[PDB]
Tab-separated table of C-alpha atoms and ligand atoms in Angstrom:
chain	number	residue	atom	x	y	z
A	1	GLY	CA	10.195	-12.627	-11.498
A	2	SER	CA	7.696	-11.181	-8.912
A	3	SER	CA	7.169	-7.591	-10.196
A	4	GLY	CA	3.581	-6.634	-9.978
A	5	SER	CA	0.573	-6.816	-12.290
A	6	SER	CA	-1.770	-7.446	-9.293
A	7	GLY	CA	-4.828	-5.630	-8.793
A	8	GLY	CA	-8.089	-7.555	-8.087
A	9	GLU	CA	-9.726	-8.104	-4.752
A	10	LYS	CA	-8.556	-5.387	-2.210
A	11	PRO	CA	-10.762	-3.660	0.328
A	12	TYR	CA	-7.932	-1.381	1.551
A	13	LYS	CA	-6.768	1.356	-0.873
A	14	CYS	CA	-4.255	4.089	-0.384
A	15	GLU	CA	-5.612	7.558	-1.064
A	16	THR	CA	-2.193	9.060	-0.885
A	17	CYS	CA	-1.325	7.432	-4.196
A	18	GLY	CA	-4.077	5.124	-5.003
A	19	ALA	CA	-2.549	1.776	-4.185
A	20	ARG	CA	-4.332	-1.337	-2.843
A	21	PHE	CA	-4.109	-4.304	-0.483
A	22	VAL	CA	-5.909	-7.334	0.742
A	23	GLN	CA	-5.084	-6.572	4.449
A	24	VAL	CA	-4.815	-3.156	6.173
A	25	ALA	CA	-1.498	-4.420	7.758
A	26	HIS	CA	-0.030	-4.081	4.283
A	27	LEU	CA	-1.648	-0.682	3.250
A	28	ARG	CA	-0.981	0.961	6.542
A	29	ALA	CA	2.564	-0.268	6.193
A	30	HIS	CA	2.701	1.260	2.665
A	31	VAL	CA	1.192	4.685	3.401
A	32	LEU	CA	4.232	5.115	5.781
A	33	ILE	CA	6.123	5.729	2.666
A	34	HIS	CA	4.638	8.955	1.693
A	35	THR	CA	3.742	10.380	5.211
A	36	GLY	CA	7.002	8.891	6.611
A	37	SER	CA	10.491	8.300	5.236
A	38	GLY	CA	12.721	5.167	5.676
A	39	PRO	CA	15.438	4.607	3.129
A	40	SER	CA	17.154	7.119	0.977
A	41	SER	CA	15.210	6.115	-2.092
A	42	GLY	CA	11.483	6.278	-2.891
B	101	LIG	ZN1	0.446	5.007	-1.479
């Protein structure tokens, strides 16, 4: 089920793509996808 459709209260926003999150720990952990590289997909 859990897919997405979530965009309400979020102070932190990813400028790299334009994402958003409630806590920095989440955003700062997502921005690593672009600047960084983990798995062989994404
Ligand atoms: Zn992003």
